[PDB]
């Protein structure tokens, strides 16, 4: 059962830095099937990299995703107000999908 | 494209309910739909899954047993029994398409809280 | 003492639903039993009442007409009938036992929240407009901002000119065209998400409230305003 | 080119309304007609939509079940019956032809009010707090401000302790009287118009938004919360 | 102690409504009951009253002969039909109680909007002459402006002669052309938005009130006239 | 048209039209009549924007219940005075004096306090 | 409301020419103008369509690389930069204002014909 | 290269002209014989008297103003704001060889 | 009861300046006076005091041994001599009557600015990352200008001991650097990445640019 | 590339002060070298420039014939020396190198604070009139407010007329003594803090410009005028 470990737990920025978040996992995640969400308070979750690299459409250029295996990074690379939420990393490689416990960009 | 989700609300432990996702902008009869949860102040936890006929429903080990997904292609609804709730259930719950290689979960549901106290 | 309420979810507009709250541990038949409601993010408010058989129920003019309290002092249990819901009911829902001048609202129920709503998980385009006041004279350049929380189609984004107790008035449409009568000083520019409002040089009949609009999808929305001064 | 609208007026809450909206100068028939409401004080927000008969009427979240927009192509009229009406349907209703790519909201009517009330020509109490917020740290004092703008008679005014994601929590009654269970540190004070509540010594479990409360009328009111963080 | 108003709205010259006011708190059957109105920007105006079974009921001397003031003291109801509206109509109006010596209008509705109009406007063309007086001697040059708010197609402008007590008299059309028998010191000139009308050299008959005119459309309009004197 | 010559109406002036004043300052507000008001039967009113109107005094000095005591009417005859001690931010708006003397009531024409 | 018409001629394959189309009556500043084109003998064919600024101009594959179509406002007048001119493109062109549900192509330009060869 | 500290709460207050004002003052040890004071200073302006002794309000200062406390916990109580009285506010112990003041707290 | 105050200006660090203080409308002689200063942006801070004479005169640890604080009862004027300034004496220096009991500083003068002073900002972030062994650590350095030769370095210390080169012009690892350290970007906007943790890779890491005469470092981000 | 300031800090008026400039890494004996200052909480002012040998050096108007500028190539400085200062000239003085086309002002010193004051400020009672401005008709009442921010001993307190181009009048001495020659339509009263003039029922001479004046101490203050139109 592949567990995803998010850190920092914690980010505190301010607008106009760049955040990276990591999402590290217990194995290997088949074919990079790595995805990131963006929720912030009281809303549903919003996708915005799959396939560990794919930005989705309408997501601005400004979030990527990169890595491989074991290792995937979100980067966000000039934060705006709008940015400041809750991240979390997806594996949907396994019939078990889990998530981390997510990242607070304040 | 869109999924409209209904039901929730609060109930004592040991109750029931069901939960009712409506889509509607895709041929849901080919998409495999995910439920998702999550308790206040907590993160994402995938609860179970459904595809095609003749594939496997697929449940989390904390809900195995008590909670059964289903689905009415005819209606374009998807559905979750809820059973044997306790107040670890309390959770805002959602309906997802899950789109694998080509987007993981594209489409959310808005969510419903439910909530399981005495 | 206790209050055990039950109930609520998400419905759809229009829709009906029924809110209880079973009492224990108080003499509830003679009770005053009010039900309050608290929107996301804002105060607690009233909601309605129900007291003893010879006094008269009372209701909000919020839900008057609409929702229904009762009760069946034979089961200790207090009832909210909620019909022709409309998303402004949007809130958490409490009953609570008043005591006036023996304890106010001194019992509460844990609350049920009760969402109205017939979309899905993606959100309407959000307009923002930034200034919220600019304070100019006349023959002076007024820009005004308007963005989208996502992008406009077709840059399908309007401006409005609303002078007080009239109605709107169009003044740019498709972002960038000037409606027939408008004078030149206006100008609409920019597309996707960040458009922009130009009045040239100020004229005293200009001082108003510009609005902008966007109709590139099925939910028409505004943005919430610029006061010009 | 031109849209003569009528009806409106007050009405109680439940109640029922029609809107008429008369068209000249264009080819009614084959046009897009909108319903765009503006509550006093606040910004456009859009109500319903119709089309062509070969296309689906459209409604907000707000009104959704309880109003129903028509057309009658023959007289040139578009109509909105408004049932089921609600405190929140209080605006201004403008009919307006939709142009789309050809001029959006290019005609409106005039607008007609729409009140929906129950009340007299006088107020309900209205409970102002301050400050909005505070930001303390604990072992210091914090001191918490309610001011009605009527007396309170008999000084039936309450405060409430709310935490993120819990119902309130009655803290003091009758302006002095500490609820049960309530540790000393909290007190109340003051009569009239002017109140007071007092934390002491603030405790990490104290930050919280507090409500002041008056119920010496039917009409029960809240003041707007202090956060006290 | 309430009165608790309805009706009003919008509607068209000419046309008819009915308004109501519920008390209670009081002995209605009793009481003198007044209805009064004001204008948007306007002040306070009494419009009529009623009282006891055995005295004369009054009404302001604009609404005579087209309002009505009436009761029913079996449901505590007070009405006032509104007949013949004109637009000096539009106004909030208001039910008050009159208490006399005792509190004169002690207790008010909280008022409904009544307005009374055909259209929304408003988009005629504006025409501005200036100035507004002219104090000039006999032997001197008049020179006297016309601003159009938009352009006045195929330069449609006419400008009248008017003395005390009688009809305006033609002295320019087509923004240049002099009619026959006025005499060549009239000359008017200008295109687009800006005509002037010149006296090239006054005669004591010469001093009167001139107005432009624009004929270019299906709403006439005239300026509000330049005093010669 | 006209349903009458006039129009012999009891015409209350009211000055000033305008007054721009701080908190803490007093307003002091006129009304002039252009006949005597017999039995003093004079009132003043209190209208926010968007309210009805909401009396202050009656019998030209006599406080309506509620009303707090730096309001203050007085005077007799003709000349009227509406004042202010002590001018709170809930004080601003605008002020109506009004005759009842007689079976045609006339207000003023109103004094802005901002 | 009119639309007048310039341009044209013979010309010889590989050639230029450019078309001109002036516009007087209505608000040529907003209006969608469109060319459309018609063969000797043949049926009305849409060549390409302009509009509002921040909307996509269009072309008629036949055309794409080829022709430009082009607006001054200040000027009312639109434009038609042919290149590449083939025999096949010989053809009567016409602009016209394009109205949508309002009326389509309610007025059209007289019409220039344009003849390729050598 | 080389006493009792003063602690202000809250470090900034928004309010309104009319409403109430109460700002704290914490010593890190009793204040003999009460010596606080309280000063209002207003920006690019020295610091002005307000009250002494804890509860002595100056000459020419008005009433609204109110001083309270004794040993480690002093109180000033601003009770109708006006817009004149948006300021910073330092308490200020003058019972020992250092003096010492609060760091202020502004009130907007 | 006036309190007449003159000097102060712009001087350079070391200099010398006197401050002087002219009282009228009270008995000087017996009254007791203080000097009170204010920094920019920072509260009042008591300075220096002066008695009847019965002098015992105190000052500050800021100011003792630099600081002259004198009076002459003939002139009613208070004076306070400012030797070997430094850019932390810059504040606004007040003369104040003290009256104790009776009205504590109940007079002030007008207050006199003394300013001592005469770059490239560096901005780290974030100001805190608490982690985990085997985690990734990723540090920005933003700078307010760009860096000519990309020469920017980072150290890193740990408690109570001098700072180490993990990386300088940007890029270079340092002799004995483990290869986890790594270095990257160029202009305004530089990134040191510390790929999986060691226990002994908690610390405070600073960046620095030594592109110009200035030297600056970036405020340290502690890795907990 | 540096300019290091030195000078200011607070001076008398009438006084002198001397600033320098010492320039570093440039060709200071060739540049054109200024003074700007910028009063406390005001905008940048250009006071003087200076350049080479062969150009004039240049004043603003407020500072000609009191402020010279000079240079000493030989030491890379710049002097500004200031005679007659007055509160007008209190600001924060920068000295800049202008490098026109090529920087404008590209090099600034750090800025020093020149403050000219001779002690204040203060213990001046405070004088504040309203409203600033009454329009009124002759016959009407008028009522002017004169407030103290402390108490005027003894009431000494009067009021003056001022009409255009004239001098003050003195109307009310001693709070409510008429003066010889008033007429009796003028009174004043009030004690303390709190002074009002009554113009009973004005006249068309009354029209004017009213100052309350207290004489109560050594600092005689003036209020700001009301003036009755």
């Known amino acids: 059962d592949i567990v995803l470990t998010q850190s920092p737990a914690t980010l505190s920025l301010s607008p106009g830095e760049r955040a990276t978040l990591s999402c590290r996992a217990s194995?290997?995640?088949?074919?990079?099937?790595l995805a990131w969400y963006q929720q912030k308070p009281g809303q549903a979750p919003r996708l915005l990299i799959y396939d560990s690299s794919s930005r989705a459409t309408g997501v601005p250029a400004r979030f990527s995703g990169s890595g491989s295996g074991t290792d995937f990074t979100l980067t966000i690379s000039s934060l705006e107000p709008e940015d400041f939420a809750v991240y979390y990393c997806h594996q949907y490689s396994d019939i078990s999908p889990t998530f981390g416990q997510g990242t607070k960009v304040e | 494209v869109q999924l409209v989700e209904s039901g929730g609300g609060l109930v004592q432990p040991g109750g029931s309910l069901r939960l009712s996702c409506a889509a509607s902008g895709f041929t849901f009869r080919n998409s495999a739909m995910h439920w998702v949860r999550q308790a206040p102040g907590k993160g994402l936890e995938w609860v179970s899954s459904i595809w095609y006929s003749g594939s496997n429903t697929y449940y989390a080990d904390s809900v195995k047993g008590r909670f059964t997904i289903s689905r009415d292609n005819s209606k374009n609804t998807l559905y979750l029994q809820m059973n044997s709730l306790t107040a670890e259930d309390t959770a805002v719950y959602y309906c997802?398409?899950?789109?694998?290689?080509?987007?993981?979960?594209?489409?959310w549901g808005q969510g419903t809280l439910v909530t399981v106290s005495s | 003492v206790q209050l055990v309420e039950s109930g609520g979810g998400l419905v759809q507009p229009g829709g009906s639903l029924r809110l209880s709250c079973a009492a224990s541990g108080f003499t509830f038949r003679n009770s005053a039993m009010h039900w309050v409601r608290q929107a996301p993010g804002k105060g607690l408010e009233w909601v309605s009442s129900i007291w003893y058989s010879g006094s008269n129920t009372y209701y909000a003019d919020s839900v008057k007409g609409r929702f229904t309290i009762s009760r069946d002092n034979s089961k200790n249990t207090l009832y909210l009938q909620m019909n022709s819901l409309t998303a402004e009911d949007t809130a958490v829902?409490?009953?609570?036992?008043?005591?006036?001048?023996?304890?106010?609202?001194?019992?509460?129920?844990?609350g049920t929240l009760v969402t109205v709503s017939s979309g899905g998980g993606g959100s309407d385009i959000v307009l923002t407009q930034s200034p919220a006041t600019l304070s100019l004279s006349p023959g002076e350049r007024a820009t005004l901002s308007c963005?989208?929380?996502?992008?406009?189609?077709?840059?399908?984004?309007?401006?409005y000119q609303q002078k007080p107790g009239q109605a709107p008035r169009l003044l740019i449409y498709d972002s960038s065209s000037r409606a027939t009568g408008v004078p030149a000083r206006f100008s609409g520019s920019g597309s996707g998400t960040d458009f922009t409002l130009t009045i040239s040089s100020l004229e005293p009949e200009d001082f108003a409230v510009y609005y902008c609009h966007q109709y590139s999808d099925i939910s028409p929305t505004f943005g919430q305003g610029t006061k010009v001064e | 080119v031109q849209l003569v609208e009528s009806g409106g007026g007050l009405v109680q809450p439940g109640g029922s309304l029609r809107l008429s909206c008369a068209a000249s100068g264009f080819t009614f028939r084959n046009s897009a007609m909108h319903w765009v409401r503006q509550a006093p004080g606040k910004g456009l927000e859009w109500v319903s939509s119709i089309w062509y008969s070969g296309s689906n009427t459209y409604y907000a979240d707000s009104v959704k079940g309880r109003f129903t927009i028509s057309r009658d192509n023959s007289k040139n009229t578009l109509y909105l019956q408004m049932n089921s009406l609600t405190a929140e349907d209080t605006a201004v209703?403008?009919?307006?032809?939709?142009?789309?790519?050809?001029?959006?909201?290019?005609?409106?009517?005039?607008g007609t009010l729409v009140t929906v009330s129950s009340g007299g020509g006088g107020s309900d109490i209205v409970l102002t707090q301050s400050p909005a917020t505070l930001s303390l740290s604990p072992g210091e004092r914090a001191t918490l401000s309610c001011?009605?703008?009527?007396?309170?008679?008999?000084?039936?005014?309450?405060?409430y302790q709310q935490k993120p994601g819990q119902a309130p929590r009655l803290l003091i009654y009758d302006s002095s009287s500490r609820a049960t269970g309530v540790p000393a540190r909290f007190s109340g004070s003051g009569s009239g118009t002017d109140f007071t509540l007092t934390i002491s010594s603030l405790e990490p479990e104290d930050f919280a938004v507090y409500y002041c409360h008056q119920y010496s009328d039917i009409s029960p009111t809240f003041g707007q919360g202090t956060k006290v963080e | 102690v309430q009165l608790v108003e309805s009706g009003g709205g919008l509607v068209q010259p000419g046309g008819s409504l009915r308004l109501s006011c519920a008390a209670s708190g009081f002995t209605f059957r009793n009481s003198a009951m007044h209805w009064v109105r004001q204008a948007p920007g306007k002040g306070l105006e009494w419009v009529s009253s009623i009282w006891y079974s055995g005295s004369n009921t009054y009404y302001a001397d604009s609404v005579k002969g087209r309002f009505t003031i009436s009761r029913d003291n079996s449901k505590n109801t007070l009405y006032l039909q509104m007949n013949s509206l004109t637009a000096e109509d539009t106004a909030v109006?208001?039910?008050?109680?009159?208490?006399?010596?005792?509190?004169?209008?002690?207790?008010?509705?909280?008022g409904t909007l009544v307005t009374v109009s055909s259209g929304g406007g408003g988009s005629d063309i504006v025409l501005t002459q200036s100035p507004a007086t002219l104090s000039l001697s006999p032997g001197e040059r008049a020179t006297l402006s016309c601003?159009?708010?938009?352009?006045?197609?195929?330069?449609?402008?006419?400008?009248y002669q008017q003395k005390p007590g009688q009809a305006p008299r033609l002295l320019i059309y087509d923004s240049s052309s002099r009619a026959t028998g006025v005499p060549a010191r009239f000359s008017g000139s200008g295109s687009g938005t800006d005509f002037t009308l010149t006296i090239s050299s006054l005669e004591p008959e010469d001093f009167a009130v001139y107005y432009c005119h624009q004929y270019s459309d299906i709403s006439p309009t005239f300026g509000q006239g330049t005093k010669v004197e | 048209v006209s349903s009458g010559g006039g129009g012999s109406d009891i015409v209350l002036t009211q000055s000033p039209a305008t007054l721009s004043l701080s908190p803490g300052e007093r307003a002091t507000l006129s009304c002039?009549?252009?006949?005597?008001?017999?039995?003093?039967?004079?009132?003043?009113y209190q209208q926010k924007p968007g309210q009805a109107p909401r009396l202050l005094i009656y019998d030209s000095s006599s406080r309506a219940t509620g009303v707090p005591a730096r309001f203050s009417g007085s005077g007799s005859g003709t000349d009227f005075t509406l004042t202010i001690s002590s001018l709170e931010p809930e004080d601003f708006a605008v002020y109506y004096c009004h005759q009842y003397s007689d079976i045609s009531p006339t207000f003023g024409q109103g004094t802005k306090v901002e | 409301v009119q639309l007048v018409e310039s341009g044209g001629g013979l010309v010889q394959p590989g050639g230029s020419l450019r078309l001109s189309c002036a516009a007087s009556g209505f608000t040529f500043r907003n209006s969608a103008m469109h060319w459309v084109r018609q063969a000797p003998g043949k049926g009305l064919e849409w060549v390409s369509s302009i509009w509002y600024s921040g909307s996509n101009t269009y072309y008629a594959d036949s055309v794409k690389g080829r022709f430009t179509i082009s607006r001054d406002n200040s000027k009312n007048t639109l434009y038609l930069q042919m290149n590449s001119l083939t025999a096949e493109d010989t053809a009567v062109?016409?602009?016209?204002?394009?109205?949508?549900?309002?009326?389509?192509?309610?007025?059209?330009?007289?019409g220039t014909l344009v003849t390729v060869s050598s | 290269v080389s006493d009792i500290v003063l602690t202000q709460s809250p470090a900034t207050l928004s309010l309104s002209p009319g409403e109430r004002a109460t700002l704290s003052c914490?010593?890190?040890?009793?204040?003999?014989?009460?010596?606080?004071?309280?000063y209002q200073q207003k920006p690019g302006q020295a610091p002005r008297l307000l009250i002494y002794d804890s509860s002595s309000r100056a000459t020419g200062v008005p009433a609204r103003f109110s001083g309270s406390g004794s040993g480690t916990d002093f109180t000033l109580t601003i009770s109708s704001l006006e817009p004149e009285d948006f300021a910073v506010y330092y308490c200020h112990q003058y019972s020992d060889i250092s003096p010492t003041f609060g760091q202020g707290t502004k009130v907007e | 009861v006036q309190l007449v105050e003159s000097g102060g200006g712009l001087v350079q660090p070391g200099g010398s300046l006197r401050l002087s203080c002219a009282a009228s409308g009270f008995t000087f002689r017996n009254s007791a006076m203080h000097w009170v200063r204010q920094a920019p942006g920072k509260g009042l801070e008591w300075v220096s005091s002066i008695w009847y004479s019965g002098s015992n005169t105190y000052y500050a640890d800021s100011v003792k041994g630099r600081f002259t604080i004198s009076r002459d009862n003939s002139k009613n004027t208070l004076y306070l001599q400012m030797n070997s300034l430094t850019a932390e004496d810059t504040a606004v220096?007040?003369?104040?009557?003290?009256?104790?009991?009776?009205?504590?500083?109940?007079?002030?003068?007008?207050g006199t600015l003394v300013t001592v002073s005469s770059d490239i900002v560096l901005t780290q972030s974030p100001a805190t990352l608490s982690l985990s062994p085997g985690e990734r650590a990723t540090l920005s350095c933003?700078?307010?200008?760009?860096?000519?030769?990309?020469?920017?370095?980072?150290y890193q210390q740990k408690p109570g001991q001098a700072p180490r080169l993990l990386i300088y012009d940007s890029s270079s690892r340092a002799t004995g650097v483990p290869a986890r350290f790594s270095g990257s970007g160029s202009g305004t906007d530089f990134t040191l990445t510390i790929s999986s943790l060691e226990p002994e890779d908690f610390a405070v890491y600073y960046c620095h640019q030594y592109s110009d005469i200035s030297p600056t470092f970036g405020q340290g981000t502690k890795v907990e | 590339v540096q300019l290091v300031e030195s000078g200011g800090g607070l001076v008398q008026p009438g006084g002198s002060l001397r600033l320098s400039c010492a320039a570093s890494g440039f060709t200071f004996r060739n540049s054109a070298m200024h003074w700007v200052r910028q009063a406390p909480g005001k905008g940048l002012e250009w006071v003087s420039s200076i350049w080479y040998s062969g150009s004039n050096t240049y004043y603003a108007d407020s500072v000609k014939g009191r402020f010279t500028i000079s240079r000493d190539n030989s030491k890379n400085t710049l002097y500004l020396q200031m005679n007659s200062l007055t509160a007008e000239d209190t600001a924060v003085?920068?000295?800049?190198?202008?490098?026109?086309?090529?920087?404008?002002?590209?090099?600034?010193?750090?800025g020093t604070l020149v403050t000219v004051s001779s002690g204040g400020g203060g213990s001046d009672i405070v004088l504040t009139q309203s409203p600033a401005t009454l329009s009124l008709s002759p016959g009407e009442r008028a009522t002017l407010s004169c407030?103290?921010?402390?108490?005027?001993?003894?009431?000494?307190?009067?009021?003056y007329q001022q009409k255009p181009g004239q001098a003050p009048r003195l109307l009310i001495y001693d709070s409510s003594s008429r003066a010889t020659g008033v007429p009796a339509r003028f009174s004043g009263s009030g004690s303390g803090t709190d002074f009002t003039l009554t113009i009973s029922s004005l006249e068309p001479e009354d029209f004017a410009v009213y100052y309350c004046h207290q004489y109560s101490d050594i600092s005689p203050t003036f209020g700001q005028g009301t003036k009755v139109e």
């Open positions: 997802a398409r899950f789109a694998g290689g080509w987007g993981a979960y594209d489409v």
């Open positions: 194995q290997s995640v088949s074919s990079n099937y």
